[PDB]
Amino acid sequence: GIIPKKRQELMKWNGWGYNDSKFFLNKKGQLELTGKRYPLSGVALPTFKDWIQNTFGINLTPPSIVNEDFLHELKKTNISYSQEADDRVFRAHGHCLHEIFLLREGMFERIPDIVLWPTCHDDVVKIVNLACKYNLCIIPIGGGTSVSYGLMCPADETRTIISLDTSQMNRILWVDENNLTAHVEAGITGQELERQLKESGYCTGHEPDSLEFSTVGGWISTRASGMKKNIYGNIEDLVVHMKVVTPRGVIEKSCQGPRMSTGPDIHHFIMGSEGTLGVITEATIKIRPTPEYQKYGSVAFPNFEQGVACLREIAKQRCAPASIRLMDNQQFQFGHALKPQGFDPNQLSVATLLFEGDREKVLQHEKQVYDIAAKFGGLAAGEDNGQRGYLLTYVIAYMRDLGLEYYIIGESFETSAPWDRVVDLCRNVKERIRRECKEKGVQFPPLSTCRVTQTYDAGACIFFYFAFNYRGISDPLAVFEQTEAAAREEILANGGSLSHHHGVGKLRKQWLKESISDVGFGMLKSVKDYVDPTNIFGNRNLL
Amino acid sequence: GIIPKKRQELMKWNGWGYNDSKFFLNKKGQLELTGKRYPLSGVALPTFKDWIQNTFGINLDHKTDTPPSIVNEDFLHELKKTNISYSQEADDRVFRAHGHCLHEIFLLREGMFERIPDIVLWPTCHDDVVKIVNLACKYNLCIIPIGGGTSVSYGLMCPADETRTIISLDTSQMNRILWVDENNLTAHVEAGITGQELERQLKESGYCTGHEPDSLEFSTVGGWISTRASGMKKNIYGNIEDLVVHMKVVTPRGVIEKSCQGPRMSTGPDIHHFIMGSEGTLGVITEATIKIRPTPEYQKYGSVAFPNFEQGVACLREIAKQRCAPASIRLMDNQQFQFGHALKPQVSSIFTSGFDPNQLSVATLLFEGDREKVLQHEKQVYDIAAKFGGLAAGEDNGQRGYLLTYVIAYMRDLGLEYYIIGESFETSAPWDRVVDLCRNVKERIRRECKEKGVQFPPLSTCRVTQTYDAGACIFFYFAFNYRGISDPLAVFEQTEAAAREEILANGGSLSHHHGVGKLRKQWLKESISDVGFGMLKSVKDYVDPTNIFGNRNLL
Ligand SMILES: Cc1cc2nc3c(=O)[nH]c(=O)nc-3n(C[C@H](O)[C@H](O)[C@H](O)COP(=O)(O)OP(=O)(O)OC[C@H]3O[C@@H](n4cnc5c(N)ncnc54)[C@H](O)[C@@H]3O)c2cc1C
Ligand SMILES: Cc1cc2nc3c(=O)[nH]c(=O)nc-3n(C[C@H](O)[C@H](O)[C@H](O)COP(=O)(O)OP(=O)(O)OC[C@H]3O[C@@H](n4cnc5c(N)ncnc54)[C@H](O)[C@@H]3O)c2cc1C
Ligand SMILES: [Cl-]
Ligand SMILES: [Cl-]
């Protein structure tokens, strides 16, 4: 649960997650996740092979450049550090498909020169002051799970780049049971956070799909969103307090009030700042008693549009359960192919549901939901089919490394949009992808899929998967990366946002000024130029 | 509900609200509000005089030019070409030279302002605002935007040593609903529309915002966004920062707006939060998209009495812990309970003055939404309450407390005719500090007054007015009879500063909703750290580099 210093002992240098977990074919020729870590671990998936085959038409380093008298002064603090190639390479990237290619195939252009491992707030203060004194460049890293190029080192950064690794700065500092808050160190992962809260009878309920590795500091930095936000809030509702070390000095409010009116909220200057302003070291987060009961469910709809209209109605009545998701037909069948052991089934769409709270309330709420669904032609599809798409939630990123071994490339991307744009966006965006792949010479129709993943009063988060069999293609990355950018253009033309939770990093920089206005961009820059005049925090995300 | 241009035709020039609405003594010597505007209007309040006498020690017998307009003639020339409506009349300028602080109100009654705006403009749309801002760059002018003029933090006071021509940029003619989107449940509005007129207009469509601050008859969308306003039913509808989905802001550097109308994004720090709470320092909010909701099918009032205030707080804490706070829940201390009881129709005899009626606190409750849910919910709340000693005090006591809300501000003016000065002030605090903060702040107040030579013990009262997961908003009221005190405004001002210091030392914030204005400037840096303060200043220096927006709030 604590990320160890040498990450490659536990985690894959060249892909997602733990060394001991990959898809392989078992002794019966069926796909299976190796290892003992998950629910799905060791569970044969008899129809997954057949699904992959039908869907995709397949069968089956630079030296360290670091100052000698900086290094000297660092030796004084006994802060742990490393200049080893694997250590720097492990931290030179996140989890974009571009990045995960290179790794396996070539080498990166720039990697950190030196990794540092602070264990507390004061360590981070010292590091930041050394960086000021000796003109060095810092890139913070927590889980390393960025999907937005947020950790890529600018290839023209000629300063020494410090990788400031927050993974040893990872304690629950205090739990305040009267105020239901917990003060934690920013390097704690979501797993280690919940596991510890759970022993006192509390949780945070913040469940991004990367919680095994993503950290509190990361969440704040990227404006992270979790599967159960309908109950617990997204990151900007969970955080009541934070402490940030910048070159200019330390940021922190003096009181733990729940809500204030003392000028523009400075917390909001830091959430989303994507590593560009300083290091978030500590944060206070709301907690909640561990829910009494959990119930899964699912609903089948005659088509995707009926499903969307139902999710709209559920949001309009303000009775979304802990989680509700609507998959289109493709993503359904994906799902249904992964089972252990009326309607037209080619347009048929499926919502999955998660209820949690008092057992009394769950089954009451559940009934209100299926009654609403029934007005749209919804029909209960059973708890097991619901319980699946959610026990399957944390495997999906192991699947990418399995596609790559068979010449399949895919990646996800997401947006949020007002309710009245959701249907046209899904359609036009899934169709632009298909159009671009054919025009770029992809030989097989891509996987082009969407789901509705979060509901809000004023609209929805939409999630896309895109993948294709690249064989016979000259330059597969370029095609892919051109098709993704075209999908983004389709997204923005259909009134969707630049991003709902992934952030901007360096992947989506080119669209920011248009998204937030020129003066908006100027405002961000003006904070940057004040907090960090000498651009110590030089990952160049956002701006 | 639209503010017409010459406000003093309708509103008091020297205090709260409407001309037609003030307290007076009726033909049988009972206090009574004039006019026909409120539910209490024209209703004799037979025990209100007694309560005032018991509480303040007065009889209720003993009662109690402008700077020239300096404006560049060329500016004026270009201003006429735009056909934007304007005034240099002294009463338009003085009306817009203040908000509703005691201190301001007092000068109004007793003297003249040091500095008042030099010209009042009334833009009717966004492009008018762009024009004005451009004219202020060109002619080196200062702009102070005003909506309702209901600020209570000095937010509208013109700094005395501002030497540039000051435009009072009044937004009240900028008041249309531009579209109501029933698909997305949003409404796009001009920022000068009042709470009253917004809700009246949405209601005709079957919708509401449910944003209900006590100043809603006058306060504006732009105002709310500027001050980070909180309304009475936030538990259901959210505070301003939850309600606003979109905004357009004209600043000297250009116009801020996002390019989409999505519910939630991750595109860097959220610039909407750079403008929320900006108190007129950065530019003009011209238009906003706000969430709306179907008009609630059903409302119910209720009330609960508790053995004491502590028990009341523990119950609110539990209700918040179970996440079942209704539309509105407010807990009043014994003094406020007694106050409310004195606002009732039965006429007492002049020869008369298991719960103790002098420690007992009362929670007022509002539930709204679907009949079925309301009712279920109401049960759940009383079931909880009953474990803290709570007894139902009846639907009429709840209804009264909430009907009373919009008249309390007319009592301040009544107080002032009889030598009583009073002012409210608020904070937010974690749960575990609430009971102590209330006990200590009230006791600081009573000690400062006595030390300052106040004769009769002051009214010092609180209520817990909002619940959150992490804490509560606490609202205080403070008043005393100043009669026979030398410099009464000084004694008052210093006692309020002392109370603020007690608040901060008991783990409370600088403000929950009133904001910082010019009144709390000295505490801000400590509140947000120096670097925090520094970031604010850098956005100010970038968006308004010549300080056109010169009201000098916050920084
Ligand atoms: C398989 C997978 C599933 C995912 N699921 C979700 C999801 O459900 N919801 C969601 O929101 N995201 C999701 N993400 C994206 C990602 O996990 C989040 O953006 C997460 O917040 C990043 O946290 P991290 O600790 O891994 O940060 P990192 O990847 O280490 O860094 C993220 C950015 O923040 C900066 N940073 C990191 N720590 C600090 C610090 N303490 N101080 C200052 N800056 C810092 C870095 O410089 C970088 O720019 C997913 C990603 C993957 C690969
Ligand atoms: C009796 C009474 C009850 C109150 N109750 C509450 C309450 O329940 N909740 C609460 O939060 N507040 C309350 N207040 C405080 C006040 O009404 C709120 O702060 C409200 O938001 C102010 O709105 P307004 O339109 O009157 O703004 P104004 O007083 O006109 O201006 C407020 C500030 O915003 C700036 N400003 C105004 N319009 C714009 C604009 N369009 N663009 C940029 N800047 C602008 C002004 O320069 C000023 O600094 C109350 C006040 C009184 C007197
Ligand atoms: Cl994700
Ligand atoms: Cl108020």
From Swiss-Prot, chain A:
Substrate binds at residue 400. This is Alkyldihydroxyacetonephosphate synthase, peroxisomal. Its EC number is 2.5.1.26. Changing residue 325 to K: Strongly reduced activity. It is an enzyme of class 2 (transferase). PROSITE patterns: FAD_PCMH (PS51387). The lineage of its organism: Eukaryota, Metazoa, Chordata, Craniata, Vertebrata. Homodimer. It catalyses: a long chain fatty alcohol + a 1-acylglycerone 3-phosphate = a 1-O-alkylglycerone 3-phosphate + a long-chain fatty acid + H(+); hexadecan-1-ol + 1-hexadecanoylglycerone 3-phosphate = 1-O-hexadecylglycerone 3-phosphate + hexadecanoate + H(+); 1-hexadecanoylglycerone 3-phosphate + a long-chain fatty acid = a 1-acylglycerone 3-phosphate + hexadecanoate. FAD binds at residues 140-146, 209-215, 222-225, 274-280. Pathway: Glycerolipid metabolism; ether lipid biosynthesis. Its cofactor is FAD. It comes from Cavia porcellus. Belongs to the FAD-binding oxidoreductase/transferase type 4 family. GO terms for molecular function: alkylglycerone-phosphate synthase activity; FAD binding. One of its GO terms (cellular component) is peroxisome. The record marks 325 as: Important for enzyme activity. It is found in: Peroxisome membrane; Peroxisome. Disulfide bonds: none annotated. Keywords: Acetylation, FAD, Flavoprotein, Lipid biosynthesis, Lipid metabolism, Membrane, Peroxisome, Phosphoprotein, Transferase, Transit peptide. Catalyzes the exchange of the acyl chain in acyl-dihydroxyacetonephosphate (acyl-DHAP) for a long chain fatty alcohol, yielding the first ether linked intermediate, i.e. alkyl-dihydroxyacetonephosphate (alkyl-DHAP), in the pathway of ether lipid biosynthesis. InterPro entries: Alkyl-DHAP_Synthase, FAD-bd_oxidored_4_C, FAD-bd_PCMH, FAD-bd_PCMH-like_sf, FAD-bd_PCMH_sub1, FAD-bd_PCMH_sub2, FAD-linked_Oxase-like_C, Oxid_FAD_bind_N.
Curated annotation (Swiss-Prot), chain B:
One of its GO terms (cellular component) is peroxisome. This is Alkyldihydroxyacetonephosphate synthase, peroxisomal. Residues 512-514, 551-555 are annotated as: Important for enzyme activity. The lineage of its organism: Eukaryota, Metazoa, Chordata, Craniata, Vertebrata. It comes from Cavia porcellus (Guinea pig). FAD binds at residues 145-151, 214-220, 227-230, 279-285. The record marks 330 as: Important for enzyme activity. Belongs to the FAD-binding oxidoreductase/transferase type 4 family. The gene is AGPS. Residues 113-295 form the FAD-binding PCMH-type domain.
